[PDB]
Symmetry: D2
Subunit: 223 residues, 4 copies
């Protein structure tokens, strides 16, 4: 009566499992998760990567707290180069990037970068891969697309926790905002979805969901 399974070695992305180590000035673990990066933006010019990058420091000032410090320093340097310390959940490394906030690049905001304050540890894990999408499903109507989209978070009206299925029944009548990364645009976007367990198809979204090493946002072979 022995196991019919054994162990084998496989390649996995470096930004998985237990990270040794972190090397973060300021010593914190939270920072500003870079989500959407607009076209022709200072954030773009600075090479901020959607989903993978975290702004952890500006001009030497560590960003441990969810306040107005980052927004004030940008507002105080509106056309001047600013230095940012960037943490990558992909390379697990820190890099210095120059960025110049501006009102003159024609988009919304001073960075052209949508951010959210959160922790960057196991942030490469909390990803839900959109698989198949039924016709006329809530997922379809909201703009979710099969296989190209990965759900990476939500605008949390109400509060509970973070895993995905644990939101869509609780928003059974109310619209839900989702953070959706796309592997063609390599960018996040806002999707507003109206969950319905009785829409007339699978689940409350009408789409499949994958989680795990088979369902992560892709990474290049080399740094």
């Amino acid at each position: 009566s022995t196991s019919l399974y054994k162990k084998a070695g496989f390649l996995v992305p470096r930004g998985s499992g237990s990270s040794q180590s972190v090397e973060i000035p300021g010593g914190g673990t939270e920072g500003y998760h870079v989500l959407r990066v607009q076209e022709n933006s200072p954030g773009h010019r600075a090479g901020l990567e959607p989903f993978f990058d975290f702004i952890v420091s500006i001009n030497g000032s560590r960003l441990n707290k969810d306040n107005d410090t980052l927004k004030d320093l940008l507002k105080a340097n509106v056309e001047k180069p600013v230095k940012m310390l960037i943490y990558s959940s992909k390379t697990l490394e820190l890099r210095e990037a120059s960025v110049t906030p501006s009102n003159l690049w024609g988009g919304q905001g001073l960075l052209g970068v949508s951010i959210r304050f959160c922790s960057f540890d196991g942030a490469n894990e909390n990803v839900w891969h959109v698989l198949e999408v039924e016709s006329n499903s809530p997922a379809a109507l909201a703009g979710l697309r099969p296989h190209s989209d990965y759900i990476i978070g939500a605008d949390t009206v109400m509060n509970e926790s973070e895993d995905l299925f644990s939101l869509i029944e609780t928003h059974e009548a109310k619209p839900l905002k989702l953070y959706v990364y796309n592997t063609d645009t390599d960018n996040c976007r806002e999707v507003i979805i109206t969950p319905n367990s009785a829409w007339g198809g699978e689940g409350s979204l009408g789409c499949g969901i994958g989680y795990g090493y088979l369902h992560r946002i892709p990474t290049r072979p080399f740094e």
Copy 2:
């Protein structure tokens, strides 16, 4: 600025989407979900199918309520043939099965069948496919196995709801009981798992999870 997606037709299992219709004597929608069926058991001899079958009626007596009616009728007919009306979430049809409860078949109980009272609508949907399993993960240690196992429910100490991810953080210290169907044994079994977000790998279980039409319990082509 038009959609890069269109609609195409694909084959899906009949026991999906919206069922027309139900045809259930007694008119209810709840019944006894057949889980584990033991070897050489009356339940086996009667052809009860794990996961797909629901006991809805016994000797004409409809089982709408989660009480002792079923257990008493079996106990009152301990070596006599009993008639059961069976609903299949696979065929969406009703069938009559003869079953003879007994103390003499050598196993545990009178049917050799583990059951749970619940609803049989969209019951083919609430399935979580175990994908990859890391070495020494909580999933590994509990007995979950890659690709062959499908999580179909839990013994719900505490209460919340039914989707899977919405349990494993709340049992961060306490063991969790899972109902696990296996596509080799075609049978359910009890798995006790100790969720840990800090075990040193992906998620709290250390396994991948698939949900949807790509991650259902398989069905034969024809009835």
Copy 3:
């Protein structure tokens, strides 16, 4: 260095890429691949597992074969119990099975078992998993079904290899016979398919195909 990937351990089935073993009494690697096992058959009664079992010996006689020896020993013991040595690609072990061939069981053959002569090494690898299936596709019409079906072989002449894609080009207009395992019936069947690159959908079959550890025939956790 610069690689963004590392190595991690995962559970995989015992019957995997490690080329072991043989250790077969009589010496060899070839035997009789058990495909279809009919209901209510002597073969079923003997516990022969479709796809996983290989008949290696009958009454001490090694089957280095593909002649009439097997059908002749069964004919000579036509209603008497015979000993078979069985090899399992699942357990990687040999077992003795008793089976009683008969003229009386009403089905085809003396065992009710469809068999084929071949080698049993890496036979758990040689499997193509049917993924999605388009409507009105060649796959659909032939009877292939999404996710429940695994193509485990074909009629091999010209001799070639065993590969599936390099079969669909040479049968670009006339039908191909496929051996298809279904994880619900736990049994093989013959599917005749007519490849057509211009049917009006993906490929020549109109179905997706998976290969590898994510796409094998499922295995129970314990022997």
Copy 4:
């Protein structure tokens, strides 16, 4: 009837199994498949998309080609803007792109664009998705990576077809060159792999392979 499956609608990409179209000025189906596009290149500046773009015309001249016409028109307008007609297998549309070939951009070629002459119909189909990759496998050593890599072609002589499996048998001992798209870099690269059936793991590459709608190169929702 007896079928346990039915039909359902799902979203799929526009560039799918429906054989449309052509409607190409100059008439044809062949052109220059844009593979690698180098960083800081005239080609990059012109917005040429790796894998999805086909160069069909330069300055009104149709490329029914695979001769030196393209390299010659680029040489004759060596630092001047030229008009290119581009076909997209993603949008199924034609667009005019301006590009200025140069001797001065420091990279290889006048465009910094690796190209190949072929037909653009069902080219979104001819993709093999790399799934899991074993350690020390041929796939690993050559540089193939799990889930982020898609094999989109090979060096085609003998002429054959384009298929991947029926390439790995004929290069059973000497190396094979593969064109590999990565969904992080959004770019192609050359991978040289040495197939070995006895490397000591699954298949001859040591990786899983997916084919079909579940395994295509991702597409953005809108054009």
